[model samples]
Target: GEELFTGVVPILVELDGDVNGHKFSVRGEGEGDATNGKLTLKFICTTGKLPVPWPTLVTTLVLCFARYPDHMKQHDFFKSAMPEGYVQERTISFKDDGYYKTRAEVKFEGDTLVNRIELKGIDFKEDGNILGHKLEYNFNSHNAYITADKQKNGIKSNFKIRHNVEDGSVQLADHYQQNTPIGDGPVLLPDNHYLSTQNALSKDPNEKRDHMVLLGFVTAAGIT
Candidate 1:
């Protein structure tokens, strides 16, 4: 019964242990009223190495953490990366600092066109043109600091990766739609989505929660 879920291994406060043939080490800066930290993983290669190899496992694990992120505090977050085809060495780290004002510090890296991602809530009023047939897509992103041109309205919210192809439209009105990403200001993600820290919609950096809804069939027409 305790195993309500299993795929996404939940890392805890300063936890150093093993899981299904994989070993994970965890550490953080704060806890309780607020918290942030780091996490690392390694496969024992002594057990369920199964049909999958280290390279694929590494890739899936890393992306899964960023994509689903089953284990994370709203205030707790860190940096992530990509993997390879062979037994490559990849590391995942998380961190956070004081200040009620939330923001991300990812910069001076990769292409100037980093990524299109969002988290928690929607950001803008989507246009009617892109509103057509609905679909499901598992798009991915490995960058930060999105621009205004990248912002677009999703069904209910904007997550980091685009799970839809043409539009944020979903086949079922009750499908899962969540595109999340950590950033410092208001910028859109792939397929033009939004995030939690996406608040600089104005020259004055106007900030506000566009909209956050209930998960699993929770309902309440938008505040506005």
Candidate 2:
């Protein structure tokens, strides 16, 4: 049988990273301002290897990374993407062309209003079940932690992380590309801030950077 997962997080951090040895790409909510966006997300893991530890950790990183100066402004990018105002109110469905099965869901609340996100998917077959269903992380104060990682001249300087409900703590790692860093307008480039997470009861964790931009990550926090 095909596995499935669906959840709603208050924030959206859409980026690509390798968590716990798996490569994953998160789809973000495209319709808000880059700096002042919501801390919510809507994601579904298609990777067949749906281990509780990895997916959950992935959502955790994305949430916090959501704070870091994610991407360039999208004042005009979105104008050419979809309709004027597109709010997604549908189930996450994708074309099927796989062998195994697994999926997950998560939610984010910023300040609480700034909550984090999570992924809950099953393993190979009756192999195992995901432990947690939701993960939330309220920003301690200002987003210096995320800034602590970058805002410098080289690799990430701090270990930006948080606690896990079903397992261990979540942490962050970072690297850099000095010499007049290059990016784009409205979507400037910030060195990659490596993300690290673990299951505590499991092996290692996954890795990802949180710089989101373009059409959506960078819109209508409260639009039509």
Return the top candidate by TM-score. Answer: 2
Error of 1 at 79 (Å): 13
lDDT of 1 by residue, 49-103 (tens): 2221121121122111222222221211212211100111112111111101111
**Best candidate (score: lDDT):** 2
Off by over 4 Å in 1: 1-37, 45-47, 62-224
**Model 2 agreement with the true structure over 1-224: per-residue lDDT tens digits:** 00000122234444343423345555544222223333333343444333333333332332222212213222122111111111111111111111112222222223211212222222322222222322232221212111211342212223322323333433221211111112222222233332222221212134233322221121222111
TM-score of each: 0.18, 0.29
Q: In each prediction, how many residue pairs overlap at the backbone (N, C-alpha, C within less than 3 A)? A: 15, 34
Q: lDDT per prediction? A: 0.20, 0.26
For model 1, state the Cα shift of residue 153 in Å: 12
